[PDB]
Structure formats: structure tokens, C-alpha cells
Amino acid sequence: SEFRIHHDVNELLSLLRVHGGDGAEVYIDLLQKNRTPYVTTTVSAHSAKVKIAEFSRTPEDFLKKYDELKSKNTRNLDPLVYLLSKLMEDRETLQYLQQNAKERAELAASAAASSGPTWQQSLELTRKMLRDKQSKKNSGQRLPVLPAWVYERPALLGDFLVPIGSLPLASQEAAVVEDLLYVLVGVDGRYISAQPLTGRQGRTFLVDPNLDLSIRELVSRILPVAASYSTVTRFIEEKSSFEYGQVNHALAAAMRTLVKEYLVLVTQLEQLQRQGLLSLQKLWFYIQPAMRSLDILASLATSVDKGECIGGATLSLLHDRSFSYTGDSQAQELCLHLTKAASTPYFEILEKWIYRGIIDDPYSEFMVEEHELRKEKIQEDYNDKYWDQRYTVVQRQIPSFLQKMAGKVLSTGKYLNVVRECGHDVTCPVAKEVVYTLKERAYVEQIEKAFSYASKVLLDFLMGEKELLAHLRSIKRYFLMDQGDFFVHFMDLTEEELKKPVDDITPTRLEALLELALRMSTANTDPFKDDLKIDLMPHDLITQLLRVLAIETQQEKAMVHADPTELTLSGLEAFSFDYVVTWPLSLIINRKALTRYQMLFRHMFYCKHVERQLCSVWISNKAAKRFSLHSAKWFAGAFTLRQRMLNFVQNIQSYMMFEVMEPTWHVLEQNLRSASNIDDVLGHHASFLDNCLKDCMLTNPELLRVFSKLMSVCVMFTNCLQRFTQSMKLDSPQLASSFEATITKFDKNFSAHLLDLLARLSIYSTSDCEHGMASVISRLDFNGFYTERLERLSAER
Amino acid sequence: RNMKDFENQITELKKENFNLKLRIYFLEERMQQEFH
Amino acid sequence: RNMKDFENQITELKKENFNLKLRIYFLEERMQQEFH
Amino acid sequence: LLGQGDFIRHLMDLLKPELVRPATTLYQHNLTGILETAVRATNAQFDSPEILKRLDVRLLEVSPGDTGWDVFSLDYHVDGPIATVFTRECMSHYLRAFNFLWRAKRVEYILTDI
């Protein structure tokens, strides 16, 4: 999709075998500047054709094929002409590309060497193809297939299935008049016959070869509407099929009105023949005005089936043919009525998808093709499809008169089906109908007003019936710390089971504690306290983040491929929360966003687990006030290093908590306080998410590893420290050898880590500028007895 | 023109690549889970 | 900092973004192949 | 046009050690917040945030032999019809006029400091 272009860029670079230069890494940004949700790739086709013909080697075949392709009316054709002439002009690109294509063909060759139409049968085949593409495309919808007696029982459309060489000349004119009265009725004459043709071809009219040439030529000149009616009857028949569309059946019925008038005019002509007062000039004098009326609709129907036009593409062709028949008001006003009649089904469908929001496409003709999806998946998958591929948009089934606002229309329709999935759908407060017009500012203005009212309704419903701001408020007190009582309750209780190894403890115990803390606390203000939970991260917030950050650089498979079964998980290591938000209600909570809020809570829980551990170790050495101020020397040095690292912990906490948490939270609160629509909310949510992706300094792999090593060393130090403090309490191997004035060894390791930490906060943060450096590296030397060593370390770098 | 704009572009490119890599990581996790 | 550091980083970031796009395209193609 | 002098006085108060240094020691985060802090302090406190967005910081070329007070310069975003007014040629003219104004402004500030 969005990267199908990147894939195509790489594929094109490979196909061209372009080694020198920077490749398409910039030309892709050129296409990124040449992308739009609408299409206006029409060029001055006359100018492009002239340029192409000038550059043509065999222009006759090119012109014939160009006429056939414009008759095919395919997409991206004219923009291809706008590229073709631009490449014939780019003679340098032309020479380098003819050479590149010859080389590609030579390479492929080397690799290979080393390694008549039946109009009725065609109509039946097309009907079968349309039935198949309607049944299979519906894929679970009843196909209102008409009785096969329609394809049978021929002549249901009603078209065509005495010597005259010696006849008197005036009698010949009158007899030819009578025979013509039979011919123009889709019927045989007495001297001029008709023949069925092969494919969508005209009724090959024969004529008395013995007839007078001047009369025969006059007949041939008047015959032109003969095929215009034979084919018109075929067109009114063939496109009536529901597989030819119900709207195209209306399109054929509309033509029925005029073909009926053409019949009525032939009937009134019968009145003059029944008066015995018919003159060939009066026929032609009258046939001239009406042959044009037949011809214009004959050509428009011929193209309407030659392009197989259907859906909004057919409406596009109709509006095109309208502007193409602009210049003949005898055709322009008729097509004005034709388009007006056609709009009814189209504008009703759009308003059904828009004015009501309920797209209903039995033939799947509407642009907005709602791609069905299960809302259960999005509640658990980090990938989301509901908000992206729930209401897909079919580009081909779209009229051109709304392409510019088709995107806003799609947004309104998506929010309308959204309120339907929310079960709170109502008709729009204004439900003015859409009328076909060559003008489009009316439609676009209606679209804008509808979009405004749709925002006013849907965004209001969102901030109301869902009230996701309260869910964010709890997403802050819970899932973002900020609930001091809750966090204290967790520390006082979950310390028991987080101590037990990841497997050692029972999740029944964990969920029981999760329930009991709230039952034994004063934080009942959570009205949605049930939408919090406990999850077992099957990785470390750091180990998973390590494999993720070290992606495609040196650990795409060196560490991304790492499995946690070979390792042991800490009881606190798997600790993580879970949440539940409905698909219609609070659908903003995606598995990816829950993953982000849980990764942030994971770092927060590692931090608070360290904080409580350090605080406990400090309280554990509570005898020093009464203990010897000198004999506790192996404890006084540890008391000093305990604040040496306590400051580092408090600083690393408060920095993010005050410069990473408050900014994201308050800025997202402002953005949501001024959010407009669903996309606006998604952006204001990303203000707290994407910005929080680096607000907590979560994007540097080297810094992540350094901080993890520091945390691991401080944890080990407080572990052997707890072992020593417990041995001291009881007396009041590796663990028995973890007290050898080990404060010095721990200082050597942790201080070396902190040296590299300050080195990173100076260098890597200097290369990244930012206030993070001044807030951490500069925060690291609050007094001169923490900066002098850092200043010497900086010199020693 | 500005040079601080090039600086901010770096931050935006970093956040964009971070979201891309988060999608890649979640996708790889899903691929490993479903295929194994 | 310096003027050329930003340009060199931008060039590297663009190359890395194109590589990320290709890798995400491969991942999405694998997702389409397996799950569909 | 090197108009409201309060911003220049802010730069004198702060950028004395940074602009004094050679162009090889450019710092961006501090420069970005220098003007932001002095916009609310100097007479440019009435400058609209939109005006501060139209304004920016830029650099010309690489030359370490010049002190930043002579070397360092600003930028401005010309957008929409404002971009159609400050044409790239006109943007060049505006930048050159600002360059001459800053050359004399730096000389004047150095004289005041002397």
C-alpha cells in the first residue's frame, strides 16, 4: 500500500540497473510530492496527440490504436500520454531508457537461454460474465437473475428479425415510401431488406438493386437512423439486466421514453401516409430533425456499452458525453434530462450512503464499498482494520463530478456507518436531495455542509456517549501511575508475588490481589476500574525493546530472533497490565496503543520496583543512628553510595515524570480539548503517544543498553546488599562472597556505567541537541562533587 | 530557508522511524506467533 | 554542531526510511501471504 | 529589516560566548530557545506565534575562521502569498539586506561592548 511505492521504487531501480547516484531515495519523495486523493491527470490531449504523432515512427497504427484506446476510456491513459510525451521530450532519459530497456531485454534473453462477432452470443456471454461478477462479487447476496425466458423468447426487445424495377417512377417513390414505412418499423419492406450483423453492428440493409439510383441513394441517406434504432432496441434490451445494473436498467428505460417518441413520430408519419399525402422531401425534411435526435443517443449508448460503463464510472462517462455533446442544444438539453434521470439512483445511493449514511449497493455500484471486518480482532491485535478497511473506497465506481470532494464524502460516510455501528444513527438534520447538474459547486457545498453537520453530530457523540476523556482520566490515575494510594497498595501487596519467579506465582493470586487492593483502598473513584487488568509480558520491557530497537542494524536477527524460553524471567519481569474497551465504544484503545501504554507502565514499574527496593534497603539499615558512627564503616560507605545512586534514581524518574509526562499529557489534553474529528483525536492521541515515544528517551539503543546495565548493576548491588543486611540481622559461596568490601567493586562497576552514562548524555545528547541533555547530563552534576569526575571523564573521551 | 528546520525534520524522521519500527516489531512478533 | 552533520544525517535517515519501507513492505507481503 | 532592537540586545546578553566562538561551534537548541525566551522579554512579546513561525534560523555556509557574532544568522518562513511576496530572488535580496544590517549591527554591538 503506502510502501507498495517504496517496493516499486526499488523494483524500478533494479529494472533500470541504476548503480551510480543516489537512486530513487529522492525520486520517491518526488512522487510523494506528486500524490493526491483525486485525479486530474488529464493533459491537453490535442497537444499530446500532436507531440506523439510527431515522434511516431508508424503513425497510422498509432492513431488507430489511440482512437481505440480512447474508445476504451481506460484509467491513467491520458496521464500516460502526459508521461509519454514528457519522455519523448526527455531525450536523455529517452536514450538512457531505450538503452536500459534493451539491456533488460538482453539480460532476460540471456537468463532464458541459460535456463467475426456474434452479437447475440456476445450479449449472452457478457450477461453470463456480469452474472458471475455479480454473484461472486456479492459472495453471499441473492442475485435477482431474470428468467432465462428473457434470453429465450427472441424478439421480446421488438427489433427486426412485387417487382419494382418496372414500377412507375412516382409509383416507385410512393411504393418505396410504403416499404420504408415498413422498414422504419423494424420490419421488412418490399424492395429493401435488412440483415442481422455480426457483433454490435448495424442492420446490413439491402435494397432493390433494380430500384432507381436517385431514390435508392435518398433511402440510404435516410437509412442512417435504421441502425440507430436496431441497435437502440438492442441497447434498451441488453442493459435492462440486473447484471447490467438496475441503474443501467433505468438508463435503458430512460432511452425507452425517447425511442417511444421516435415510434410515435413514425406513427404520426403513418397518419400522413394514411392520408395518401407523402412526399419524399417531406420525409427527409422531417427525417433530418429526428435522425440527429436518434444518433446522439445511439452514440452515447454505443459508448455506454463499448466501455461497459457501470457505477460512478458510467456517470463519469455520462458527464463526459454531456460536455462532449455540448455545442448541440438539441443534444445538450436531452442529455441534461438523461443525466438528471440517471442521477436519481446515483444520488439516492450517495445520499443513502451520505444523507442517511447507510450505503446500500445491491449491485455494488457505489464508490464507498464497505469492506466487512470483525470488530473483535481490533480489540486484541495491534494492527487495526476497522478504522481503515471497514469502509473501503472503490475508485472505479465514482462519478467525476465529486472526485474533488470524494475524500470528504468518504470521511462523512465512514463516520455515518460509524454512528450506525454505534447504534445511534439518525437521519441528517438536513436531507436535501442531490440533483444532476453540470455545475458541481452545489454538490460540493452540500458535501461541505453535510461534513460539518456530521462532525457536529459524530464528534459530539464521541465526546458524549463514549466520553473517552474520562477513560483517559483513568488511563492516567491507573495505567500511568498518578494514583498514589493505588501504587502504595500495589507496593505493599504485589511485592509478595513479584518476588516469586515469573512461573513461581499464580495469576489467580495476582488477579485476587488486583481485586483486593481496590476492595481495601480509598480509590473507588474509578468508575471504569474494571477496564484495568494484569498481563504477563512474555519478554522484558528491555529485552523486547532491545530486539526491537536493534532492528535491521545489527540485531534484525542477532537479537530480534532471540527467544525468552532459554532465559529466566523475573517475577516482576513479566508484570504488565491489560485493558478492555468496546469496539463501538472506546474503540480508541487498540492493541498497539495498549502496548505503548503498557510499555510505559513497564518502565514505570521497573522504576518503582527499584525505588521501593532502594527505600527498603535504606530502612533496613536503620540501626546506623544507634549503631557506631565509626564501626559501621562498611555500612557508612554503603550509606553514602546509597544516596549516590538514590539521587541518580530520583533524577532519572523525575526528569521523565516532569519533562516527559507532563508535556505529553497536557499537550494531548489541549489538543483533545480542541479536537475536531476522529483524525484530529488520533493526532492529539499521537501527541501523547508518538511524542512519548521519545519523551521518556525510548529510542536510543545504546542509551537503552547503558541504562539497563546500570539498573542491572544497581539491582545486583542491592541484592548482595540485602543478603548482607539479612546476614547482619540474623547474626545480630557466591552470596557468602558477595561481601568483601564489595562497595568498592560495586562502585567500580556502577561508576564505570555512570561514566558511560554521562558520556552518552554529553555526546549522544550533544549530537541530538534537545533539552534532554541539559536535563540529565547537566542534572547529573548538581554540586561540584559529581561534576569534577564527569568533567575529567569528558576530557578522557 | 532554515537550518533548525533540518533539525526538527530529524526529530520527525526519528519519530516516524520509531513508529515504523514499532509496527515492524509487532508485525514480526505476530508473524512468529502465527507461523509458530 | 555543523551544517554538514545535519545533511549527512538526513541522507542516512532517508536511506534508512527507504530501507524501513522495503522491510515493512516485505513484512506486509508475508502477512498477506500467510493470513490471506 | 533588523528592526526591533530588543531581540538584538537579547542576543548580545546571551550569545556573547556562542557568537564570539568560531563558526565551528554552532549550537542549535540554545539558539532556538534564546529567541523564544527573549520574544516574551523584549518588545517582541507582542509578536504573534504566527510571526515567530514565519521567522526561523538559518546558516549560510561553513567557515570556522569567523566568530559567530559575525557568522551566525537567522531564517524566516515565507509561505503562501507571503512566499509570493518574498520571492526566492526577493528572499535573497531580503537576506542580503539583513546581512548588511547585521554586519553593521554586530559592529555597533561590539563598539558598545568595547
Add this chain to the structure above:
Amino acid sequence: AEETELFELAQAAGGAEVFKILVDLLKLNVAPLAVFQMLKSMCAG
């Protein structure tokens, strides 16, 4: 993507490799000249 019509156009070109990835790009609402410039950028090699 009307591969039949793309090949028909390629045959009627009578010019000097299918390059239908670019046809996909042109049907991806790509500019008929922004890619024209990239055509020479890549043709330079």
C-alpha cells in the same frame, strides 16, 4: 490493472522490460511529469 491494455499500448508504441510498475504508479495518482523527471534521474545511472 488492465495488463491487456498496457501491453496493447506497449505494442502500439512501436518505440525502443514492461515497466508496468510505473503504470501502477500512474494509476496510484502519481504525476505524469514528476515521474517523468525521475525517468531521467534514473536514466542517468
